Amino acid sequence: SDAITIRTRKVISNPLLARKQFVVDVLHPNRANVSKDELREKLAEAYKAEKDAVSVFGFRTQYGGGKSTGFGLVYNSVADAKKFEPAYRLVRYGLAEKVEKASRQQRKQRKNRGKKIFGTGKSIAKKAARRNAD
């Protein structure tokens, strides 16, 4: 009596982005939300596409449980999904990796520190070293 059933309303093709856009209306009684990865797979074999060229987001389980609604897209190829989707969706789905970024404050600190020096700092480092030498 689980029978998670899925529907794609307002589906529009879009070769401008080589995609198919729709709103995901998922009916699921006696159950919590649909755990996106599982519904991505469901749309994958629903539209005859790989689990990589399918994306869902913006979900909202309506008041009182049961129905839930989100937005979904099906890309023509996995490469197009790679080259068109935002980085954070490619991180959610495991097809990309979080970029090793320093925090914003440290980046700004380093930007100002680079501002302090005109040109490469190769000369000034040795100059200062031999300066405090004497």
Partner: peptide, 12 residues
């Protein structure tokens, strides 16, 4: 509504 936001319009 072919796009979704600014980045999509830029890519289009």
């Amino acid at each position: 509504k072919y796009a979704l936001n600014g980045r999509e319009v830029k890519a289009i």
